[PDB]
Symmetry: C2
Amino acid sequence: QLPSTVLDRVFEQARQQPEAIALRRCDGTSALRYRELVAEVGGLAADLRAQSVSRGSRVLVISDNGPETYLSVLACAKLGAIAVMADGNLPIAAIERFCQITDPAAALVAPGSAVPEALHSIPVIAVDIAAHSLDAASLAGNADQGSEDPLAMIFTSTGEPKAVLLANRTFFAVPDILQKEGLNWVTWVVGETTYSPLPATHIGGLWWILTCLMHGGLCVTGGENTTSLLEILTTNAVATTCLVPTLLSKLVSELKSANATVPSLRLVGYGGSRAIAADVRFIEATGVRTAQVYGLSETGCTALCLPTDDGSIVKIEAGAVGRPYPGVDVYLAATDGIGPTAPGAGPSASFGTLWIKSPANMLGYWNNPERTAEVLIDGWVNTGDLLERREDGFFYIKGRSSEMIICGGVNIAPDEVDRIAEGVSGVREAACYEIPDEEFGALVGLAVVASAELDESAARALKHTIAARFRRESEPMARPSTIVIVTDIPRTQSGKVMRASLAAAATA
Amino acid sequence: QLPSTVLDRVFEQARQQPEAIALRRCDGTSALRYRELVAEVGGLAADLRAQSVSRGSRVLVISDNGPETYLSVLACAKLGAIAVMADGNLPIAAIERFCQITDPAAALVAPGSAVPEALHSIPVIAVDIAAHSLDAASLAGNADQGSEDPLAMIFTSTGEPKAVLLANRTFFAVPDILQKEGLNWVTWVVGETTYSPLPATHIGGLWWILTCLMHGGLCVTGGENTTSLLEILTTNAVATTCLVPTLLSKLVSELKSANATVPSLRLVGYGGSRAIAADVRFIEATGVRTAQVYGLSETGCTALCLPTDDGSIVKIEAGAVGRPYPGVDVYLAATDGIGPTAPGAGPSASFGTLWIKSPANMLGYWNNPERTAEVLIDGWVNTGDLLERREDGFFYIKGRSSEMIICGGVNIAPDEVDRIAEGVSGVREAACYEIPDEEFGALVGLAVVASAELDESAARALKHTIAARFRRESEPMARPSTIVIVTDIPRTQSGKVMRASLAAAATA
Ligand SMILES: CCCCCCCCCCCC(=O)OP(=O)(O)OC[C@H]1O[C@@H](n2cnc3c(N)ncnc32)[C@H](O)[C@@H]1O
Ligand SMILES: CCCCCCCCCCCC(=O)OP(=O)(O)OC[C@H]1O[C@@H](n2cnc3c(N)ncnc32)[C@H](O)[C@@H]1O
Ligand SMILES: [Mg+2]
Ligand SMILES: [Mg+2]
């Protein structure tokens, strides 16, 4: 039986490999060995204790996505305090808003990114690191916390922001399931190097690093010196990383612009928005295993998973988000206002709003019982997302299918649009895709591959030429609403254009 | 030739009918005759002058939607100052945000709805009224302003708010067109009573009252004592009013709940969201003329209009928003990034993003040249809305047509859904409607008329019964996503269900 708190599971790794490096930035500064982490947690928690910060107290962790932030989280955990995750880049008014919601007892400021008015009334502690033996006095003193005790808070927006309270179990519930069931969808390897572009104030970022820390991994976060992702993954020789479809799309573009490969890369976790099947297939060709994750902050990150397997690329293109881990219960509410907690009807539908009952679910929105009671009922979380459980057992976030692009009410054949587009001089290859529209059904989006290498002006010139061509040759509604110059066009082995991969990339 | 500023046009009415009442609340307090308005404008402008408020200066008008607010606007106009419209109900952080954007020289506070930090550094003037001859010293002293000089600012949001700078011409450009062209789409009658539920910080509210003030009308605003609209319109015997589809829908419900009528009501102006053809037809049966208006804050309120006429209800149901006033130029950009200001292509399409060139258009977003240059180019405003100019000359904000409700990819017949629903015991009448969805094409929305009069519990009980019925009798995707108990179901004279009126009301 593993320890029941995040901090204890981390310290257990610190006992096995105390000299192993735990946290460091991309360049290498703010580096912490596991023994240095334990020592610094104790010191910072001692500094917090001098500011009336006790068990249950809330601490505003002004994040920098670096080692100092996750140190600050674990320092709060030592007191049994709650680490309120606040983005350092955000304007003062946002952070001032955060303080009013959470009413923190103190603030932990990690460098780096003129302070809010609320911080003038509360204690503020600066947290930074510089460049022995495993101290047993810092290993002792862990507050008697449990899996149900709150650890951190993550903010989520439609307009107004809410504070998602997360217990310790959120960060190990699913990993323990994968271990117990002997599943390989997402795996950790002790000592291996990982990187997170996702901020610590992001549910995906905070969750990922903590899971890696509890598995004794080398976690590289914060201190980005380059906009290049290919560089960081190869410079630091990472094995695993957590991405959003936009960032994975960026990486693939870099892996194409240069005949490149990240050999050290073993596993890629991706999610947050519409998956791009083209980018996933490309990186699986490299030999890297991937796993799509579906979830919310309210569900403690991942709840459904889509790991690398036969036919995976096919269903990801069809809009599959995956299927739940064993122990995570799912329910499709066909009618609004009638969930699984409603008496009578009924069994889960094959289509409807997704309700999730997971051991990683939130405790509830902080200081907001009214809204919490609309989303969290009897352990079930209303995701508010429409899903479809198809006849294969997978859940799809979009529906099938548009064979023609029906704009307004007129059926528009993609082959015709492609033909007209390809009839233009400067174009080598062209493919259109469907852009959904509530008012007009669908829109015509057009991806274009230029024969030559165009600058900013030549590309714009080609764009206006293609549009003027459609104005004359085609008719409404068969006129492209958007025309974009793309490096390449993803196709199946049958030669069929993967238009969903184009659409997903168009939004991202 | 009429005066070129709003203030001068108002004062001209104050010369014709100085004893006529200009502004008052719903109950009757804060009442101002036109001569009392002129006197109070001068005094308040004198009070502003003592706080370094000169021509071009910006004044934060903390609105209350009452007479004191519009007094404050006209007082700013006297100095040639800009009245920054700020909602009093909004939280401190919002108003603090407003001050940072506009950098005001002073603030005019009208009672009623703990002040922002920014107001501690700027002068603050309280403005309230209580209970002779037309003073010629207050009639004189109007700063030499023109139609192009800025008068007020209106804030608009996706997430972040922008300050829309509006010149004087915004408030009389279109009215002057209607007068010159001899059109009757929207008319004013001197002395008549008008009411505005829309706030002064709303573009529709501020615009409406100012137009009525310049036409010498009795303007009732602010100081709402009841939630009943039927009462206010009948108590104060108004002739005209400005509404949003939600409020018009509310009024109709009240006009049904009691066998009632607003006889004094002559004209109803409505717009802002999807028009409900059922509610419009109902109030036109009363004998009241209506006019739909399409526009943005960036276009100085209304730009297109749909007045009461033969076949109007038919096209409003089809999603028509109207057609431009003579002088207002429209352009449908078929492809994103290619507007009317783009060289080459082309003539206006019959489908695309609407660009509007109007004499009522904004001057630009305050202190934001970058975003202004993306929306306001050579006098054209990018509405960002997809419109379709059908073969009748009207512009439609939605497309035709869903004959079947295609959820996922399955064609679903409304007659079948209606039948299953009506087969339930407690239901007298039932009709479904299409709810557009980007991911699944469409959803099934269901409107239900109960045979008896149900309380809150009996209605919920009926709802769950109907849903459980569809779970068993029907199949996905033909299961209703939403089930609502409605008072009645709008039909044509042919008996056909006006399902768009149901959908529009469902969103509102
Ligand atoms: C290895 C694991 C870490 C690597 C991945 C880290 C990213 C995963 C963290 C996700 C949680 C998060 O971002 O917070 P939020 O509450 O905003 O998300 C919820 C909203 O987002 C959308 N959505 C999430 N999943 C999605 C997915 N699969 N397909 C498509 N839409 C997805 C949904 O529409 C939902 O409304
Ligand atoms: C007698 C005249 C006064 C009585 C009416 C007063 C209300 C009219 C004032 C409207 C201006 C306003 O509300 O500001 P905003 O910039 O938010 O509006 C712009 C947005 O709103 C939507 N939209 C406006 N018009 C609409 C209409 N006709 N159909 C459907 N959608 C309409 C559009 O989608 C647009 O994106
Ligand atoms: Mg997300
Ligand atoms: Mg609006």
